[model samples]
Target: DVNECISNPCQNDATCLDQIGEFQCICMPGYEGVYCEI
Candidate 1:
């Protein structure tokens, strides 16, 4: 499967988790955006 968390693309201190077939980004406090970059 593809691993999205390997790149550490999230910029808001969010946590990236690899799901069954996709990926899930769990944003940290005070953060809301795709990949948690914004």
Candidate 2:
């Protein structure tokens, strides 16, 4: 019941998408991981 993207969870210039119960991070050119940490 919240907009996860508001927190900007994604890193390294990634994209943040909020879901029903969670969030998704779209990595940039050289980033990868659940939160774009890898």
Candidate 3:
């Protein structure tokens, strides 16, 4: 299994979760987007 979250995909103080062949970004308050950039 490749850990794609090593590059820190989540932005704006969001949480990074490692998944198989992909990753999950948990957006924080005041941030909403695919990478939590907005």
Candidate 4:
């Protein structure tokens, strides 16, 4: 399998999780988005 989300793109001090095709961002309390760029 391939890797993704090498860099931390999440905002508001969120966490980055690597997925197979698409990466999931673990957003903070008030952050929510594909990359948690809120």
Candidate 5:
């Protein structure tokens, strides 16, 4: 089985980090949110 909340799915230019049982997306500079929307 997979750890649903332990995966980071952020796309290009974005950095995906695993935190506890969830994910924290640190978008590239001007990017934002899990999708990295500008």
Candidate 6:
């Protein structure tokens, strides 16, 4: 399968990091948590 990070799934416009088992959103200012949907 393809990586979801390249598709930019984060709603807050955060950078998506592709991992072995999951994806991490690089949240910036005024954003937090996993999705960064602040």
| Whole-model lDDT values for every prediction | 0.70, 0.72, 0.74, 0.68, 0.60, 0.70
- Cα error, candidate 4, residue 25 (Å): 0.3
Alpha-carbon RMSD to native, per candidate: 2.2, 2.1, 2.2, 2.6, 3.1, 2.2
Instruction: Show where candidate 3 strays beyond 4 Å.
Output: none
What is the TM-score of each predicted model, taking all chains together? 0.53, 0.50, 0.60, 0.50, 0.45, 0.50
In terms of lDDT, the poorest run of 10 residues in model 6 is 1-10
User: Where's the lowest-lDDT run of ten residues in candidate 2?
Assistant: 1-10
Reference-based TM-score, model 5: 0.45
Model 4 scores a C-alpha lDDT of 0.68
**Per-residue lDDT of 1-38 in model 5, one digit per residue for the tens?**
35543445666556566655665677677766566665
Per-residue lDDT over 1-38 for candidate 3, one digit per residue giving the tens place of the 0 to 100 score: 56878756876666788677666887887777889777
Q: Tell me the lDDT of model 6 at 24.
A: 70
Clashes of each: 0, 0, 0, 0, 0, 0
Q: Write the per-residue lDDT of candidate 4 for residues 5-31, one digit (tens) a residue.
A: 666767557777777777677887766
| Model 2 lDDT tens row, 1-38 | 56757756865677677688876777787776777788
- Collision pairs in model 1: none
Error of 2 at 16 (Å): 1.5
Q: What lDDT does candidate 5 reach at residue 16?
A: 65
What is the overall TM-score of model 4 with all chains considered together?
0.50
Off by over 4 Å in 4: none
Question: Model 6 reaches what TM-score against the true structure?
Answer: 0.50
Model with the higher TM-score, candidate 1 or 3:
3
Q: Which of 2 and 5 is the better model by TM-score?
A: 2
**Could you tell me the C-alpha RMSD of candidate 2 in Å?**
2.1
On the 0 to 100 scale, the lDDT of residue 13 in model 1 is 66
